[PDB]
Amino acid sequence: PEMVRGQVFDVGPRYTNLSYIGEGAYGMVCSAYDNLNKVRVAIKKISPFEHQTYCQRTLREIKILLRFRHENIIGINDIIRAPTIEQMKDVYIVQDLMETDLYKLLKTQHLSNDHICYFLYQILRGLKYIHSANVLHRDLKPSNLLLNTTCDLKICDFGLARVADPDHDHTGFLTEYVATRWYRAPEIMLNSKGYTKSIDIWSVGCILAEMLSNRPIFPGKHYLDQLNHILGILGSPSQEDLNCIINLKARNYLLSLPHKNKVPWNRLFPNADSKALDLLDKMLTFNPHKRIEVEQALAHPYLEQYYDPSDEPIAEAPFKLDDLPKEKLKELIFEETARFQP
Numbered sequence: 001p002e003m004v005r006g007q008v009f010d011v012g013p014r015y016t017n018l019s020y021i022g023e024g025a026y027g028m029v030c031s032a033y034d035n036l037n038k039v040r041v042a043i044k045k046i047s048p049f050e051h052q053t054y055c056q057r058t059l060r061e062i063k064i065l066l067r068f069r070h071e072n073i074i075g076i077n078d079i080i081r082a083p084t085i086e087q088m089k090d091v092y093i094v095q096d097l098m099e100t101d102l103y104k105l106l107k108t109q110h111l112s113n114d115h116i117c118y119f120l121y122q123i124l125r126g127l128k129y130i131h132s133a134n135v136l137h138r139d140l141k142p143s144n145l146l147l148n149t150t151c152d153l154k155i156c157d158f159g160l161a162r163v164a165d166p167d168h169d170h171t172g173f174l175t176e177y178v179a180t181r182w183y184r185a186p187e188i189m190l191n192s193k194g195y196t197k198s199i200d201i202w203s204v205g206c207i208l209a210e211m212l213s214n215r216p217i218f219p220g221k222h223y224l225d226q227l228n229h230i231l232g233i234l235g236s237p238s239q240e241d242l243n244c245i246i247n248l249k250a251r252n253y254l255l256s257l258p259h260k261n262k263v264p265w266n267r268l269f270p271n272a273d274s275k276a277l278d279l280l281d282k283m284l285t286f287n288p289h290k291r292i293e294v295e296q297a298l299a300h301p302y303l304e305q306y307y308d309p310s311d312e313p314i315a316e317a318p319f320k321l322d323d324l325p326k327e328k329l330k331e332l333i334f335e336e337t338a339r340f341q342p
């Protein structure tokens with residue numbers, strides 16, 4: 001078996017000529033030559049079976065990506081694993097090889113307004129499909145947006161996804177931990193479990209702001225600092241928006257703060273397209289019930305050159321693990337991956 005950087009990467013004989021790419025959320029990522037399709041691909045090594053939580057995330061990722069089929073969502077081309085559960089220690093997921101991701105791109109490249117518009121359109125087109133399946137991604141951020149050499153954009157990593165459950169979204173103050181901090185909506189810290197589609201729209205708004213300036217708009221230094229940054233730009237919430245928060249601890253925290261004025265978007269982004277800033281404002285709206293939804297965002301004037309609802313498909317079959325032991329989850333992963341055996 002081929003090895004990479006002193007570690008088994010057991011993918012042959014179909015996949016050869018391996019090169020290290022990096023260390024992702026699940027393990028080592030390499031490129032490899034696909035001797036059948038005669039193209040180089042990405043291969044991700046996953047070793048989850050010692051821990052129930054790792055098995056949960058791996059099953060979510062595989063189950064969702066196998067059921068979705070969309071141009072703006074990364075597909076699974078192949079899955080490599082041992083022929084029996086007893087011999088299965090690792091799982092390798094094979095995907096199209098993508099030149100870069102939006103995190104790496106923003107480290108060194110200024111985006112044209114035309115690229116910002118195109119990237120945002122593709123993110124929302126993919127998200128429309130995800131939401132139409134009753135699924136929440138719950139970890140949208142630049143490093144989960146892959147790009148190939150012609151700037152085709154694909155959303156990746158569904159290991160933190162959930163089925164939407166808006167009727168059970170309310171919770172208490174300072175208890176919830178959903179999404180990566182900088183992309184986390186204000187209500188997560190106030191009264192929300194992150195079970196509604198508006199959590200994803202907030203993250204897309206954060207990504208849009210970051211595309212406009214190459215810096216994160218709300219760079220909280222730790223969990224508690226994140227709300228300080230959000231309110232420092234949005235300003236104090238209105239009485240109407242506070243009246244929508246029934247939880248007293250959350251509401252009284254906001255009432256205890258000194259008044260803060262809104263910072264106008266065009267002062268933060270003086271070279272931005274004014275239509276982009278109008279859409280940005282609607283995605284970064286404090287009240288999640290007033291926040292724009294994905295189909296409204298696609299129809300916004302900023303995206304008029306691309307908008308075409310008949311070419312913005314939805315899922316055929318929406319989705320309608322907490323307590324399973326890792327042994328049952330391993331068996332489920334084994335069954336989910338059987339179609340690729342051979």
Ligand SMILES: [N-]=[N+]=NC[C@H]1O[C@@H](n2c(SCCCC(=O)O)nc3c(N)ncnc32)[C@H](O)[C@@H]1O
Pocket residue numbers: 021022023024025026029042044095096097098099100101143144146156157
């Ligand atoms: N940081 N880091 N290490 C991982 C390194 O892998 C890269 N990469 C990922 S991983 C995507 C996010 C979720 C995960 O972490 O699994 N998929 C890729 C793919 N299809 N094609 C090419 N490269 C990929 C990623 O662009 C980075 O260069």
